Amino acid sequence: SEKAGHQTSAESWGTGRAVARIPRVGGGGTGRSGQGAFGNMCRGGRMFAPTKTWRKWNVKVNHNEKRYATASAIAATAVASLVLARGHRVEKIPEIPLVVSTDLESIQKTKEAVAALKAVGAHSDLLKVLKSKKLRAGKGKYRNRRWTQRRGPLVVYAEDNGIVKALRNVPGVETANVASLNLLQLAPGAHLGRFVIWTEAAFTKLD
């Protein structure tokens, strides 16, 4: 608050009273009177350099450089040297990149959507989630950040017919379109090598 620490009429007693010449609360009979105020070292005062709303929050990024890292993050979904080092459990799968049929995009139910991910080798990576759900160490728990879990597969489609809703409730699994290809999901934590499952329609549209 801009008025925090300045809601009093404290005035300095000056020198000659064997006390610090920092302004003190006037009046009497309450205990608060005679106490220091208006200082960063005083109890109940304002802090040094109060935080302002006009601090820079969003950072401008060049559009070509933004696409440069996104293309580098798609190329990070190449050979599993980066993918294994990124924490994903992709040792017992056929190959990278994984290209599946378009029939994922028309799947409506979560149960059949989940079973399709188990068949293509993502069984191990899904159990990395639902077993790493740990309570947060910091104070953010009562700041709506109570739980923390690992990151699962990224399913990429060309046109949505129900795959987004089917995989919405599956923990750790994010769905994205070839049009967007968010860098926040392709390299989360500034770590390259996200495990990404492509559909056949999405893979050809990627070109």
């Binding site: 000659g16 009273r17 064997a18 009497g28 009979g29 309450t30 205990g31 009177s33 005679g34």
Partner: peptide, 19 residues
């Protein structure tokens, strides 16, 4: 518990003569 006593500074030593 009564209110805190008001601060009560000292009688400020007797003034020397000023030329």
């Amino acid at each position: 518990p009564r209110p805190r006593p008001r601060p009560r500074p000292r009688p400020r030593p007797r003034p020397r003569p000023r030329p």
